[PDB]
Amino acid sequence: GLGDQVYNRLLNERIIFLGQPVDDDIANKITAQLLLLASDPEKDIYLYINSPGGSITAGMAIYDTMQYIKNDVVTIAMGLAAAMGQFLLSAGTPGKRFALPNAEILIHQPSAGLAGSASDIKIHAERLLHTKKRMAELTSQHTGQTIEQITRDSDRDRWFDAFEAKEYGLIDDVMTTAAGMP
Amino acid sequence: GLGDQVYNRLLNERIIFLGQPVDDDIANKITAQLLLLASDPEKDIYLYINSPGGSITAGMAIYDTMQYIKNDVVTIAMGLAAAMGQFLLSAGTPGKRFALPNAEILIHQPSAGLAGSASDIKIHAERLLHTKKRMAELTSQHTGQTIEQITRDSDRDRWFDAFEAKEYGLIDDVMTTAAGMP
Amino acid sequence: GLGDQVYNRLLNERIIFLGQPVDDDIANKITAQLLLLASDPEKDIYLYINSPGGSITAGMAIYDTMQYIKNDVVTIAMGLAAAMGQFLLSAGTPGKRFALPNAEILIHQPSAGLAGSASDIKIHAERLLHTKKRMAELTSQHTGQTIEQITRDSDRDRWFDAFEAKEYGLIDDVMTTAAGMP
Amino acid sequence: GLGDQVYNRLLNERIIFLGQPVDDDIANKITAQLLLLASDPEKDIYLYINSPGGSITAGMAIYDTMQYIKNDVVTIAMGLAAAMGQFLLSAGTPGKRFALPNAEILIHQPSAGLAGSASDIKIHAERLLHTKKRMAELTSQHTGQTIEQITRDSDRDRWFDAFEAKEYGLIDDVMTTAAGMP
Amino acid sequence: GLGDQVYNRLLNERIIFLGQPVDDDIANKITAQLLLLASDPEKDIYLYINSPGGSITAGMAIYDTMQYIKNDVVTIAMGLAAAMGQFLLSAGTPGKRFALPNAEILIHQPSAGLAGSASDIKIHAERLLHTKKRMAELTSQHTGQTIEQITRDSDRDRWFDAFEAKEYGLIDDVMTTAAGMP
Amino acid sequence: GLGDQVYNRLLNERIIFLGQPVDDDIANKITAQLLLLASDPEKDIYLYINSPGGSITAGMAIYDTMQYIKNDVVTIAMGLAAAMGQFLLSAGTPGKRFALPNAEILIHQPSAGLAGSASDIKIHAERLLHTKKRMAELTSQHTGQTIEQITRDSDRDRWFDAFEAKEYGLIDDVMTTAAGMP
Amino acid sequence: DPYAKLFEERVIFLGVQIDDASANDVMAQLLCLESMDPDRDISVYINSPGGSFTALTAIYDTMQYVKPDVQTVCMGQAAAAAAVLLAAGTPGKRMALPNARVLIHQPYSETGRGQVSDLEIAANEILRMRSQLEDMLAKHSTTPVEKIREDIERDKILTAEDALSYGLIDQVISTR
Amino acid sequence: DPYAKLFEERVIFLGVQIDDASANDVMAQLLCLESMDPDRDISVYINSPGGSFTALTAIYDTMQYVKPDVQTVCMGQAAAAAAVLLAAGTPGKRMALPNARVLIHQPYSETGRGQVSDLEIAANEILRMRSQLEDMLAKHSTTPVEKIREDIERDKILTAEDALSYGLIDQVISTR
Amino acid sequence: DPYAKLFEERVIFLGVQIDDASANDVMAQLLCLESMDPDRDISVYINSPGGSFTALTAIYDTMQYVKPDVQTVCMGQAAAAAAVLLAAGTPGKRMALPNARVLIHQPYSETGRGQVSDLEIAANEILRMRSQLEDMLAKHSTTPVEKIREDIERDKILTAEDALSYGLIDQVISTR
Amino acid sequence: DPYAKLFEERVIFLGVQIDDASANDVMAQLLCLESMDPDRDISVYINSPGGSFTALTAIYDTMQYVKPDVQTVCMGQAAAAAAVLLAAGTPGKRMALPNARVLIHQPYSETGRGQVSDLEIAANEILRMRSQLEDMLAKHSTTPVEKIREDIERDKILTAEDALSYGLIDQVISTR
Amino acid sequence: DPYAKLFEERVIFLGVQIDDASANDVMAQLLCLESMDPDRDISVYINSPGGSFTALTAIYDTMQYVKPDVQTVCMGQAAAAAAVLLAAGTPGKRMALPNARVLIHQPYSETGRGQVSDLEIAANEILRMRSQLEDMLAKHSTTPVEKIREDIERDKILTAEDALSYGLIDQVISTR
């Protein structure tokens, strides 16, 4: 009731909220909203991220859609931006990635559950390794760090403050008041 | 509230979303949407596929409906297109099948579960063999590969990248920018 | 959200969908829809069937309603038409029963589960035999085959392709393109 | 919902549906519909019965309401009219009780469950016997058969075909086409 | 129906309610409401708090959003304001934090649950200690007390009356009549 | 459906209902309704109470809001007014507390469930004793009886009739017909 | 366990709800004690809240069929079915401990779901059962038929001295 | 335990519902007692509410096959399956206690879900089983085929004297 | 336990459904009986509704390996796996009680979830197993393979005399 | 218990799914029999669908460790893990019953939730273990390693004569 | 039970997860065998997936407190907690079977439900526990402490020969 109404009134101003674990449904909704807002190709889109992570394919779909449209996408980190949500936050257009002063950013490596015969398990393990390598490459591309350091740090979780994230390259600026957002 | 609104607003632009496992309900819904959009006889239809597969009969109904209507159908793979969803993605009109750069496609052979007497199990096993042969034949027809290659390749699970899928014949092109699609 | 709007806009064009197991609820709904569309006695009604079958009394009520109204009923088989759904598919007006090229038709004898004393079980077994005989006779009437052939063929489960179903007599034509229906 | 809409239009014309077990809720809704349609004391009311029966008191309330209002009530049996649903079907105004050609009718005697001290069981058993006698008397009144024959027939389950039901006196006529009812 | 309309009119009056445990959903909703009400740069926002607290990251998001917008936020403590709720209540703009005469306030140190290997547990324990230190620093900044006093008082649960909270520095005034409300 | 509508009309007539156990949800709704109705500061507010009681914090918030607004509150006891509901019923403005002739009023002492170490349990037990003392003081203030008599009487459960409640001091009058309310 | 040792002492226990298994066990014990010398009494201690009718009647018929005397001692409590067995001992040999309590009340059942004819048959069965228990209780007590019918309409609870006065027991033993 | 002691006294207890395990145990005891001298009788006490119909038949056939006489006494209650076994004892040697009750009624079953052909086959076998059970009961009683078929149509509960008059038992024993 | 005493008398009971544990126990008993003097017969009583088909063949192979003969007596009910074991006894020594029933029908299974290839392999094995059971039953009877195939399609229930005529049983015993 | 009696005749059973407890019991029995004189063979009967693999390996090297010969007899079925132990007996002393079935296939597992590194390590170990099992089976059979790799990729089911020809067993015994 | 007979031979089995009950049994057996002649050795066979650390430490301390030598035989598998106990045997008397697998990895836990202070205390406890376990394992092997730091960061699985080379196992036995 109230939530749908306030979210519609916010979407009327080109603002998208991603505030739950990333599964197929939420990724489908975010892709639909981005495609809908892509009708006007000269106005930017703001995405607010407070998520603990989620699935890999759904996040890949969201990332591809973000890189697909002509409109620039401004990513804002509020609260928690962990696991693949961090990847989506770092995937915004350069110069337009921000985080609030008391936000937490976490870097993680993929996890999966496998069951079947040895050949099927071999195939799925190879695919999981390929997915991990792809995520490492994309993170290295988006933050500017070398692919070696990202591998080392993603090994076991690494938590980052706003200023630490800005120094690392995950975000571009830390905002305090409303003068900073474009 | 939000999802229904954005989906209706997108369907007004002739865009159909298939973002869940394929069962009777979703197949019925996609068939109904295609039948309604068939009222306008020369405008194309876009289908976005992010699904892990589903039931055989429902997918065959969707395939037959897509091959039935006079309008061309453009299939787009975002995220995951696995098992029968891959078959639906490859079933689009020639020259109008694309995938996103991080799209990821899986080819899978059918599976089933049977119970009953020996004669009933024999009948159902024969029907399952017939279904597998029919799917292999349809995939060979749509992808331009020989039937033997499809039969040998689909025994296990094979995963495809966007460029590997393009070379294989499942799709025709890989998008990077909105200017690349009709 | 979506499904109600799509189904309403389709029913506005005299399209009825039967895409779930046949029980009392959707049999009641289909009877209501047929009675409503019976207001105009000159236009035909199209019924799309994708169902695995269901209860006997509900399907029989649907059959009687279809034979009741003055408007002709065209039946389309898409996906699966099994058990009692096959009976409804072959119950359409002669010359107006079609199936899609990849549709599967299944002929199946009735089944039931009883409980109670010996006299009650005897009565219910007699009633079940009566229902089986009635279904065999009605299928023979609507198909053109002799009663003995239907009785012998329905002992086990027989699967039918579209062309095999057409040769058998359950359907009248196989649907390929939009020029088919009037 | 689509079902709500079609039921609204059907009730608008003059039709009332009864397609589920008779409980307090559906009896209340049937009584409300009859009371509202009693606004015009001249036009008739049509009641369609497809139900396996239910609680005795709710059906008693429905029967009393049907016998109360000045409007004549036409009863139609489609599919199954068993247990107390048969009693409701036979309770229509004389000359306006029909059934479809494949409509199947069952006559049943009451059943109940009891618990408590040996003094309460006596009272409840006497009340159950009184209810059974009342139902036998009402059936004998409405079908024209003698009370003894009705009791002997309802001692154990008897199943009725449409023509057998007409001969027995439960209904007045069997319809086949749209020209048979007012 | 009822339960959303009154909230809608109150929001139209620039009143926000926070009366259930703080989680991702309600933090997202409160952030959306604050962003919407920020459309008018010059009118204050009143927030009513009756909650037992909740997740730390959600409270951080709400706190950052409250400190973000240009409009002053007036916090009213009604009923219970414990753990995260107390921190949010004390986070209002200076001179505009209030509590009802029987309002009851609790100060409580963070708690969490961990699982995994020794290295992961070490990392998460370090993060939890960092979170506790940050909360102590923010509380000391907002209430004007020294860090040592706050970190000594929060070791156990301390309960505050309205006047005790006012003396401590958590709130600014306690009223009895609508005359004193800003 | 019906309930929301009738409650909306009654709220338009300045009538509030409290007919379920008092918890945070119902306490946030009643406080919202009181704040909404406080827009016009010259018309009285009527509150009907039929509840078995609930949590102390929610009821205390309701009490504070009732004492907060400028409008006079008239409390009507119907059915049951027990525990915290009795406290709210006795909290109305003097001269405007009424009960129906067959109303039931029960005085109860607080109960709680505690767990944890022997140092936390000490704090929570002291807080519970403080809450009981505050409740006794407020009841004594609103009834006119001495604190000692209230403390002695609420040790066990005491039931009150309407006339007994009026003599005790919990209500001001017992009403029978429509001439009772001002 | 002490149960076997008390078996060698001709002591039988009924300290659970009456049921088929307990009735079969008690009957086996009674027949075994018959297999011993038929000129020695049997001591049965009853602490039970009642149970099924048919097991109760089986135990009662065994006690009436068993040749040596069966002395019954109420201990703890004896309610419903337990009261029937306690009062069914040989005359002059029914005792109760000073602080034990005795309860008598009418039979209870739950005639399961079934047709009207089945419920009629079961209800007649229940009425006959209730009459038979009343007659048996009146035989073993000094009270007439009408009084026993009147008292068991609702729960009536009797103490040791009240039970002795009524006739459910013959004496109250305090110390051996 | 007393069960073995009574086994040395060649008495057998049937105090549970008839099932595969209980029937196996009972006929194992019957064959064991057959293994001793064939000139000694066997006593069976029957307190059962019924049970399966194949296990009933196994026990019945073992009783009719084993050489020495089998004594059956009614025990609290003897329902449908228990009634057949109670009446299956040797002629002139079937007894009941004064307060035990006997029930006779037609078989009940739950024909599982299946095709029409399977239901037809199962129903035919059910009717055959009903007819065979009625014939077996009629041979063990003085009453003819028609009366027995009429009486098991619904539940009919008989007392000890009624059972003796009808033919279910031969005598009612009040004392040893 | 009477089962051990019957073990001393060379009597083996099959009163439960055929499973792995029951079959292991049965062949352990058979091997133990064969371990002593091999000039004594073994008596097996079968009252079972059937069960697993591998354990079936385990018991069957054990019966056809030992030298001592195995007389098989039908008991109450012998269906499916029980019928094949009942017919597997030594020729001239397969008996049935007068009121026992015998059922024969084709094997049942549930080919679990798997790919097409796995279901193909499992279905081929199931067909081979059904043919092997058909041939095995045909050899132990007098009827050819085609007749057994025709009678195995649906359930076929036989009485004692019908089983004697068909060939599943060599004689029906009423007394010893 | 017949199992202990068969233990006195140095006979061991493997009639359940292979697990830690069953494997522990089997090795304890093997060690106990080895502690006796080392000049007598041990007969082990296998009727199992397989199970845990490390426990299987423990049983395997326990059999390969003791001095006396271990004779394996197939029974009913010996699938997957059970097939490895059946073929692990001493050469010339591996036998099967005429109607037993043998199945071989590749190991199955479920690498649980973990990071990419953990799944990599577990999958590497699984591939190593599959290679080890294939090599072990190749050594105990006449077939080369490549053929065993090819035939294990799917489910292959062999009868007694087929197993004799392939090399999983040495002879098929029909009678003692 | 073969376990008692093996107890007579002074062999102890650890074939389940390490828990409080298993540790209680194992250390009770060790104290018992210490009570007899203190010049005979003790044989322990380990096939365990590991378990609790405190029970591990109890068993380890009992092993080093008991005077006679304890020889450990790796078998089946020896996971983290099993590896520590396996390597805890007396030097020169730690053995493994050819096909056994050995795994070592860091401790795991759930220092969870709690305030901040409790989690801090538990985390310091866990770090101390890990350091102590690693130091203990380093003393029982030849490798330095830093190598063990680096090696149990993730799972590392060793075969028999690899375990011999690393230092976990003294010698690998193929036959007695």
Residue numbers in the entry:
A (entry chain E), B (entry chain F), C (entry chain G), D (entry chain A), E (entry chain D), F (entry chain C): 31 to 212
G (entry chain I), H (entry chain H), I (entry chain N), J (entry chain M), K (entry chain L): 52 to 227
From the paper:
The Clp protease system is important for maintaining proteostasis in bacteria. It consists of ClpP serine proteases and an AAA+ Clp-ATPase such as ClpC1. The hexameric ATPase ClpC1 utilizes the energy of ATP binding and hydrolysis to engage, unfold, and translocate substrates into the proteolytic chamber of homo- or hetero-tetradecameric ClpP for degradation. Here, we present cryo-EM structures of the substrate-bound ClpC1:shClpP1P2 from Streptomyces hawaiiensis, and shClpP1P2 in complex with ADEP1, a natural compound produced by S. hawaiiensis and known to cause over-activation and dysregulation of the ClpP proteolytic core chamber.
Removal of the N-terminal flexible regions (first 29 residues removed in shClpP1 and first 49 residues removed in shClpP2) improved solubility of the expressed recombinant proteins. Since the truncated proteins yielded poor homogeneity in the assembly of shClpP1P2, single mutations of the conserved catalytic residue (S113A in shClpP1 and S131A in shClpP2) were further introduced to stabilize the stacked ring structure by attenuation of the complex activity. The two proteins were separately purified and in vitro assembled into the shClpP1P2 complex for cryo-EM analysis. The reconstruction of the assembled shClpP1P2 chamber was obtained at a resolution of 2.88 Å with an imposed C7 symmetry. However, the free shClpP1P2 particles resulted in a C7 symmetric reconstruction at an overall resolution of 2.34 Å. Since there is almost no difference between the two shClpP1P2 reconstructions that were obtained above from two data sets (RMSD ~0.594 Å), the reconstruction with a better resolution was used for the following structure determination and analysis. The assembled shClpP1P2 chamber is likely in the active extended conformation, consisting of two heptameric stacking rings that are formed by shClpP1 and shClpP2, respectively. Numerous hydrogen bonds and salt bridges were detected within the interfaces between the adjacent protomers of shClpP1 and shClpP2, accounting for the inter- and intra-ring stabilization. In the apo form of shClpP1P2, the hydrophobic cleft is covered by the C-terminus of shClpP1/P2, which may protect the complex against the hydrophilic environment. Our results show that shClpP1 can only form a heptameric ring structure, and the handle domain specialty of shClpP1 may prohibit it from forming a homo-tetradecameric structure.
